[PDB]
Design a protein around this ligand. Structure first.
Ligand code: NA
Ligand code: NA
Lengths: 397, 405
């Protein structure tokens, strides 16, 4: 078994049976891929996407849309089982009556969304109103999309749909291309492994794609398209006056750019990127992404007292939203060496050891993932040190 | 009618007039929320995530697919997923064969989930490993579930905690979580007594509780808590019961399963109704309000007041304070109109920047809550806002670690 995926499965970044840890299974989205460490890593990534694209941008608003669309091409259809049963009860068929049923399914049944684009379009007229028709602006959503494989794969997509006058659309597309690529790179240990290329679709529309170089090859993690206006006009038949936005004095139907990232594949990219057979394997996930910031353990000494102290430190750090692994809670004894190796595989940023010394003089032993050196710190400072350290890494962007 | 109409007008809600009836709002057949509403809901979901997961070292995140293995034997009402190809292929490409085809759909097609429970159950053994089998612990998830309407598909965002505990302590945990969840809804409410609970029991004598919000048309359940026992967990691992045991001290037991399940969309609607006060103002809790501050300009040099505002804007966003940039509009609106609008959008504070500000750095700050105005130095606003928001959330967090009985 490949080492990175093996470690990820052992440390609960990935879930699944061993056969589901193949490249094809991991890329298909046909099983829930992530275990608790992975779900947390992915939530951190999604939060960082939200910060960059919605929180820090006044012209981007959140949107939410259904998972199913009116029914498109290969998308699975939603069919009520009660309708099928109704049919299977009646003794006389036909072929006319059955074919009819099947025919009617193919034309009236809703279908699973393949992208988040249609949800943004359908909410455009309302956001336009909210912004008093001023262009440009965006609508953003993170949510699951469904993809026929070759079973239906599920992928978490982070979408920005940007509405701008056609005359600035090319400029906007290039701005998003650079910004999005820099966003992926800012969390990477090997930022050159995130690359980009131009592409064009079936219709000749221009776009770009962003890629991560996985061991087996490059996989697209984000696509950016200059869609023009057809999809928007397709959404609002007749009523054109209600979709025109202001470009200064001009009233115009805006051009639509779609900027869509694969949060799941992006999670897997950072897991591969983090792997350092440095020392023993370590996952050096970026501080803002690492699911566990600190681990707390008790050394040789008085069980119940040494744990009362860790509990207090845990509670303090959690009130401050710092994730903590309560190793002190464990029963089985494990060597310091074994602990550090595990924490390193889990991408834990700092490990803290509370000992009889601590009970005497209040000093803890603090070990860093990145340098791997141990320092003595007074328990009273730990919180401020950690709170400050994370804020520093998050400020870098 | 006034509330829904105001919400629709201010983009808390979305939809046509036929989508704004109480029936359509409850069905989940359309995406109910406009941008201010999606932000409100995101804030509510973040608060839930903080209280249930971030602050609880024995609760872990789980993610599970939206689709589940096809069954059909039972007759369940969950929508099935059918490949259009498959249908076309039998269609344009006799009776015996068609009936068999339909039978197959019912038996083998995947189905859309109706709850997040099975998701948690299926990841229980992994989490067991993660905690080296120590009970109790929980698996949490927020995600969309689907449900039959009337033949339409309703979508509801569910916030679920599935808690694994020894049977001997399961009753106490049920009571602990009930109090905890009820207090969680109430801490954001203008009228907390409109959030209540009721105890209940199921077909099999299993105990549960339900939490309700008293909407204008009656009480609606916004959360359910059930002491499920172990049946469902046991059914998830047939033939592996010996190795799904957790530790209760020194004893190995198959844990009892507590399922706590909250409706995030209905909860969002609850807070919209709860915030509505007569001027019409929505007094949403500071932690929930989608826009914390609006910045506007009064009398003065356009291109300079705007720079003061933008600077202010940049500073607040950088600090993650949501801000409405009213100064970028054209402004042919009165102060009273501007304020009435902000009150309806639940904006917590509005700030006015004028010539004077350029002379002495003073801005006029207006509170949604009292409508009182007040001069303040533009350099002190970021700090005022951050402290006001931290204070509100601290007050709200007062009892997140309170030991219920
Ligand atoms: Na924004
Ligand atoms: Na937790």
């Amino acid at each position: 078994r490949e080492a990175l995926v093996d470690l990820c499965r052992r440390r609960h970044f990935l879930s699944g049976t061993p056969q589901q840890l193949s490249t094809a299974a991991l890329l298909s989205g046909c099983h829930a891929r992530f275990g608790p460490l992975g779900v947390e890593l992915r939530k951190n990534l999604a939060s960082q996407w939200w910060s960059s694209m919605v929180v820090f941008r006044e012209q981007v608003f959140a949107v939410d849309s259904l998972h199913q669309e009116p029914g498109r091409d290969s998308a699975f259809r939603l069919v009520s089982p009660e309708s099928i049963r109704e049919i299977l009860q009646d003794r006389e068929p036909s072929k006319e009556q059955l074919v009819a049923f099947l025919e009617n399914l193919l034309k009236t049944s809703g279908k699973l969304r393949a992208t988040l684009l249609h949800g943004a379009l359908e909410h455009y007229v309302n956001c336009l109103d909210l912004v008093n028709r001023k262009l440009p602006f965006g609508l953003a959503q993170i949510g699951v999309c469904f993809h026929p494989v070759s079973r239906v794969g599920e992928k978490t997509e982070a979408s920005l749909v940007w509405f701008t006058p056609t005359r600035t659309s090319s400029q906007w597309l290039d701005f998003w291309l650079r910004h999005r690529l820099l966003w992926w790179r800012k969390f990477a240990m090997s930022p050159s492994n995130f690359s980009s290329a131009d592409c064009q679709d079936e219709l000749g529309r221009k776009g770009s794609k962003l890629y991560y170089s996985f061991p087996w090859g490059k996989e697209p993690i984000e696509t950016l398209w200059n869609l023009g206006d057809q999809e928007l006009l397709h959404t609002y038949p007749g009523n054109v006056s209600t979709i025109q936005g202001r470009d200064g004095r001009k009233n115009v139907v805006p051009c639509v750019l779609s900027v869509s990232g694969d949060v799941d594949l992006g999670t897997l990219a950072y897991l591969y990127d983090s792997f350092q057979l440095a020392e023993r394997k370590v996952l050096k996930l970026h501080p803002c992404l690492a699911p566990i910031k600190v681990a707390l353990d008790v050394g040789k000494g008085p069980t119940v007292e040494l744990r009362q102290v860790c509990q207090g430190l845990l509670n303090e750090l959690l009130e401050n939203g710092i994730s903590v692994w309560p190793g002190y809670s464990e029963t089985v004894h494990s060597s310091l060496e074994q602990l550090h190796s595990k924490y390193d595989e889990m991408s834990v940023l700092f490990s803290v050891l509370v000992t009889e010394t601590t009970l005497e003089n209040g000093l803890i032993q603090l070990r860093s993932r990145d340098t791997t050196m141990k320092e003595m710190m007074h328990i009273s400072k730990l919180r401020d040190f950690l709170v400050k350290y994370l804020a520093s890494a998050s400020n870098v962007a």
